[PDB]
Structures are given as C-alpha cells and as structure tokens.
Amino acid sequence: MNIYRYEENPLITPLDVKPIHEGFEVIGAFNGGVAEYNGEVLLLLRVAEKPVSEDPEIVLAPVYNAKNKELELQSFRLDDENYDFEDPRMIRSKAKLEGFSYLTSLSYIRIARSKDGHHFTLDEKPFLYPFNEYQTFGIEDARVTQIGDTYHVNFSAVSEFGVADALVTTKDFENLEYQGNIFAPENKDVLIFPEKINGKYYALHRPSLKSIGNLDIWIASSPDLRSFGDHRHLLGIRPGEYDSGRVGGGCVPIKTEEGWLILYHGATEENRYVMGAALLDLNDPTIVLKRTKTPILEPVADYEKNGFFGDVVFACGAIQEGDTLHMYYGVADTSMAGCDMKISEILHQLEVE
Amino acid sequence: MNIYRYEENPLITPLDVKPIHEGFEVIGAFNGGVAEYNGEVLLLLRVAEKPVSEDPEIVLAPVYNAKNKELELQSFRLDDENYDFEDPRMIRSKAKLEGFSYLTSLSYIRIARSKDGHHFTLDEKPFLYPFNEYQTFGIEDARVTQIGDTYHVNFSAVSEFGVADALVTTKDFENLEYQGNIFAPENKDVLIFPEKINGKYYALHRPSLKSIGNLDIWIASSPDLRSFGDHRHLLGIRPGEYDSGRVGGGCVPIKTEEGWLILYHGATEENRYVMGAALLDLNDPTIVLKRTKTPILEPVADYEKNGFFGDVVFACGAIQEGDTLHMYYGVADTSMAGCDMKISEILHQLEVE
Ligand SMILES: OC[C@H]1O[C@@H](O[C@H]2[C@@H](O)[C@H](O)[C@@H](CO)O[C@H]2O)[C@@H](O)[C@@H](O)[C@@H]1O
Ligand SMILES: OC[C@H]1O[C@@H](O[C@H]2[C@@H](O)[C@H](O)[C@@H](CO)O[C@H]2O)[C@@H](O)[C@@H](O)[C@@H]1O
C-alpha cells in the first residue's frame, strides 16, 4: 500500500485535551469513531482519564457509581500480592490474568470537528459520559454508522456486569436516543453495515469467550437495528500471522463493486496491532471472499510505535471520497492519526494475496 | 415445601437407552426439555455418549466433523502434563482451567413420551443430532416453549467457535425449521417466555464472561423470537449462598397472578446444583420482585447424589396442571427424575423469604 500519513500527525494528543475530572490526567484521546455531519468531519474521541495518586504505592480505579452519579474511587496497593499491575490498562487478579478486576482509567466520548480533515477543534463538553450501571468503568471506542439521516453510535459499555456493546441514535449529535445493550457481554468491535442488505440489517461483532473459542469476528442480522440474531462466525484468528492473537472489526463496511470491504484490526499475542482487510459477498455478507495475508497499515511512525500502549494502530472509522479513504486511527492508545489510502489498492492487495 | 418425588424415579437411566455410535457408551440421559403434544408428555432428553478406550492410560474426545458428517476421535494420555482430567465432563488445558479444549462425551436430543407422566417410551430415532459447524461437540439441554401451536426448541450448541444457543421451531416434532444461533457465544440456559408481554417477546439467558462479570442470569427482548436485544442483567450470584458460583434459567417462566415465576438452578463453587425461585413483574419482567433464600429442590435422593457428576438437580421444564407443577429434572448428569410441587407453595416460600 501507498499510505499517505498526514503531515500534522498525530492530529490530537493528550496535550490537546484538558481533563474533565479534578485531579486526573488525560492519558489518551484515541480510537475515535468517524462521521460527516453538516459539512465537517467528526471524530468521536475516546478520552481516557486516570486519577493521580498522592501516594506512589497506591493506584486508584476510577469507577462511576450509577446510583450517586459520581465517581467513587477505589484504591489498591501495588504490593498487594492478590493483584498484578503489569498491564498498564488494568488491575488484574493474579488468579485471573485472562481478565481484569478494574481498569486503570475511565473513558468517555468527546467530539472533535474539522473542516479540512486535518485540523480539529474539540466540542466544549463531552458527548457521551457513563450514564448507567453498564458503564461504570467507562464508555469506549464509539463507532458511527450513518444510514440516511440517522447516525448509529455504538460503543463498549464496561462494568462489573461485563463488557457489552450499546447503541445511541441521533440525527444531529445533540438530541440522543438510548437504544440499550444491542449485544450482550462479552462483546465489543460492533460495526453496523451502512444499508439494509436483501431485506436485513447486519452488524459485525466480536464475542470474547471464557471456555472455548478464539477472539474471532462474528456477524449478526437484524430487522430493526435494535435486536440481533442469526449469529455466525466470520473471520478467525490465524496462527503465525499478524492476526494470530485476535481480530476485531475496525471501520464501517465499505460498499464496493466487488463486495463489502472490511478494514479490521488484527493483533499478535504480544499485542502488536495492525489493520488488515477482508471482502465479503455483496448480497450475503456472511460469506467471506478474500482476506489479506499482510497488513494494510502497521505501526511504523514514532507516534504509532511509542505511547501509553506501544505498537498499536487501531482504526475505528474512515470517510470515502471516491477511490480515496480518509482513515482515522488511534495510535499507541494515546493519540489520533490520519492517513489516506486508495480503495482500489486495498482491493488489489486482496486480489493478489 | 413438600416434594412428591415419583416412585418410579429415576424415570429414564442410561440402562434404558442404547448408544447410536459404535464403540460408545451412554453416560447420561438427562436435562430434558418438557412439552405436551397430542395428549402425551414429551421429554427432549440430552443423551450423552462417551467413546470407550480399552487402554486405561488413554481417553478419547468425540468430535462431530461438520464437513464429513462423521465422528472423529481425538486421543489423549491421562499423564499428559499439559492437560487436566479432574473434571469428568471435560478435557482442560492446564493453562486454561477456566475453560475446556474438549468434552468427554457428545450429546444429542432424543424424545421420550408418556401418557401418565411417570412411565416413558423412547422414540425410535434421535430428534436433533449435531448438524452444523456450531454443534461439533454436541447439542445439549433443549428447552421447549410452546406459544400457540408452535414449539420453540432451543439448545446449547457447543463447538470450537464457542458455546452458543440455537433455535428450531416445529408444530409437530416432525417438520423442523432451523432458526440459527439466537444467542451468540458464550451463552446457554435460554428460556423463552410463553407469551408476548406488552408488545415484545422476552427470553432469559446466561452470558459466561471471560474478562469481568459473574455467571448471572440476563434478559433480552425480541420482536419475533429470532432476533434479541435490549440486554439487561437480571439475577446475580450471591456469595456464601446456595447460588454463590452460578445461576441459570431452568424451567420456562410460569405466569401467576403475582408475576412470572422463575424456577432457576444455582450452584456453589463446588458444583452442587439446587433449584431456587424468583418472581418477576408481570408487565415488565426486567424487574425482580422476590427471590428465594433457600432452595426449593436439592440433591438428596441417592440418584441425585450419585452418578456421572454427583450432587446435581437440574430442571429444564415442567407441566402446569392448575396449582400442581409436574417438574422433570436431570439428576447427577446421569438420568431423569420427576416430582410434583405446588405453585402456591413456591409463591408462599417467596413471600416468607
Ligand atoms: O489496548 C489495545 C486495544 O485493546 C482493546 O481494549 C483494551 C482497553 O482499551 C479496554 O479499556 C479494555 C476493556 O474494554 O479492553 C482492553 O482489551 C481494544 O478494544 C482497544 O480499545 C484498544 O486500543
Ligand atoms: O454438569 C452440571 C451442569 O453443568 C452445565 O453443563 C456442563 C456440561 O454438561 C456441558 O457439556 C459443558 C458445555 O456446555 O458445560 C458444562 O458446564 C449445565 O449447563 C448442565 O448441562 C449440567 O447439568
């Protein structure tokens, strides 16, 4: 691929963003959902804030109390032999290193808008902030699918009940309608297809499985974009490849003449994240036609390789302008970057590989 | 309360059922779904067959290969230092004790029918046998909800992709229609409510969660009993109590003047299973009104205590006859038993506790 990485990269960094919580630091502004509205590019940024502990032997978990509608910080000692603090994103029990007891930060969604796609201005206030008992550890990684005049904004809802995926709909980014947890825990990386397809709506999703099964992309159909069923396995991990550890939905499916083009992320077990592509049948998106054998975007620039969680590119949306895709991606779980690519080149790579 | 355990218990044992796979033994006929059809009680038995190995140092896992439509057997040495065989239901990686690599048996569904509710006769052939790539490790624990003339038969579908819940509909138990995986993995113990409730159908379900969340009962709504949404947390585990390790739905919700009566199973962390009860609001079954503090049925008969996996009662369905519930339950993951209880007495226990 001939990727054009934007000269202004990284576009938006934690320095650009002031914390909304007293005594917290912004540790990322990343993984932003992408929409066009009223002549501007909107990035629905995930902003992660972490409390600063006065004592460096203590870390705090920033948990939202749904009954009181405020944070209630929970403290943990670094030397507590019950807990493992080696993954900077979470507090883990040593007996459950496959999961977490708490996250180290709390996320919410805040919009940034651009007229030229390159220079962004933040909206004054947050857009979505934890509002119920399914979001007590944060709202994360908001995706946006526009169908007609309606924007479907769906996001990870993290709490003690699990990691679910929930939906808000809106025609203007001001008047919001909550549509509930559209996928049960454990799920995330939900991408709603941008039109009805032979009588059904579809969404990619990504169950995380305790007993058996890998971290694989699934698809579901829907009559109404509120209820989903007919769940099917779609894209699996591949041992020895860039997506040996996990795969998940990235950008919204892109209609091409050759099929639905899926720009998904893949990671190894070492947690290096890249973007790959797949192509699904136009008329029945449950059928996979081609998949890349090498990535379309990987961490190579310094901003991609270095940050809060290094060696990550994580694209949550893109805007098509003919053959050109303006892709926006989180980098290193820290900042937002932008690049342009050609859809025809992605298709070509699919064909070749 | 007082429980009328049938004099004929256990009603159906592995001794009553011949294996359909050469070189296998029936290890359980259990956890049967319950329906009334054409003047008879139908039990949709889970029949688990285990491949027998003449070498005691070796065990075998039965896998249905969805391409050849044939059983393949995977062998293991019991002294393999990478696997754990201590749970007789499963073959586990020592690095993943919270899950499984294989099961020790393969299940399918076979109908038994009765005129009197006590004496049963097996149908000649199986009813549902693994038929797709979601069912390679078996079809388990069929629940049946009858709405008008249509029987909704929904069951665990176990494979290398995860443990999903799938649905077949029928008006006659002869012509079957497959409706897909109505719940994505990891889920099971799905109980469809027996009527439309203020404009929506409902089902109990039970996400199993890798990262965070306990093994808790959830609820979802649906427009058509094919797709489900608006997932909500319903009944959680209680540390220190009979349901400290997990809860899941048992029988189909029973309409009472006081609300939807839910006969659920609970287990401790030591895997002792009992039945409990809860009461949901009649008009909004997302609201829990009452729950038992002590069980309504425990494993105390010899056939409940001793067998393939001892100290289990697991009721998957009941027939209502006025105030009497004729409840049928798996015992020790081995056999089927029946008892009669009274709806009014369970409601009374709910009120008292
Ligand atoms: O950190 C890489 C990548 O990992 C996943 O999210 C992680 C973290 O951000 C999140 O807070 C928790 C809980 O949902 O799950 C971690 O696995 C991605 O979904 C993405 O958000 C991260 O960029
Ligand atoms: O064994 C008790 C109880 O446990 C659950 O099922 C177990 C087993 O039968 C099943 O084969 C695997 C895979 O689905 O999960 C085990 O946990 C219950 O659902 C029930 O079937 C058993 O009676």
Judged by CB atoms closer than 8 Å, whether chains meet at B232 and A185 is answered as no
- Using CB atoms, which residue from B160, B209, B228 is nearest to A212? B160
Domain with A301, as residue range(s), is 1-353
Going by CA atoms, what residue is nearest to atom 13 of ligand 2? B158
How far is the C-alpha of A312 from the C-alpha of A316, rounded, in Å? 13
Number of domains in chain B: 1
Place of tokens 């980014």: A173
Residues having CB closer than 6 A to ligand 2 are B 31, 89, 103, 140-141, 156, 158, 163, 188, 309, 312, 314, 330, 333
DSSP class of residue A94 equals: T
Radius of gyration of chain A from its Cα atoms, rounded to whole angstroms: 19
Specify the resolution in Å. Answer: 1.8
What are the C-alpha distances in Å from A73 to residues A52, A84, A280, B229, B333?
11, 19, 45, 32, 45
Judged by CB atoms closer than 8 Å, whether chains meet at A233 and B161 is answered as yes
Chain B contacts of A228, Cβ < 8 Å?
Answer: 227-229
- For a pocket test of ligand 1, which of A64, A264, A314, A334 has the largest count of ligand atoms closer than 8 A to its C-beta? A314
B307: Cβ contacts below 8 Å, ≥ 6 apart: B28, B331, B332, B333, B334, B335
DSSP string, A253-322: PEEETTEEEEEEEEE-TT--EEEEEEEE-SS-TTSEEEE-SS-SB---SHHHHSSSS-SBEEEEEEEEET
Judged by CB atoms closer than 8 Å, whether chains meet at B222 and A218 is answered as no
Measured in degrees and rounded to the nearest 5, phi and psi for residue A17 equal -130, 120
- Name the closest residue on chain B to residue A92, using Cα atoms: B211
- Taking a C-beta distance cutoff of 8 angstroms, is the pair A139, A154 a contact? no
How far is the C-alpha of B4 from the C-alpha of B324, rounded, in Å? 11
Annotated binding residue A16: no
SS (H, E, C) B106-129: EEEEEEEEECCCCCCEECCCCCEC
DSSP string, A31-68: EEEEEEETTEEEEEEEEEEEEPPSSTTEEEE--EETTT
- Name the closest residue on chain A to residue B92, using Cα atoms: A211
Judged by CB atoms closer than 8 Å, whether chains meet at B213 and A183 is answered as no
Place of tokens 């979505």: A128
- Cα B36 to its chain centre, rounded Å, is 18
Name the experimental technique: X-ray
DSSP class of residue A197 equals: B
- Taking a C-beta distance cutoff of 8 angstroms, is the pair A137, A156 a contact? no
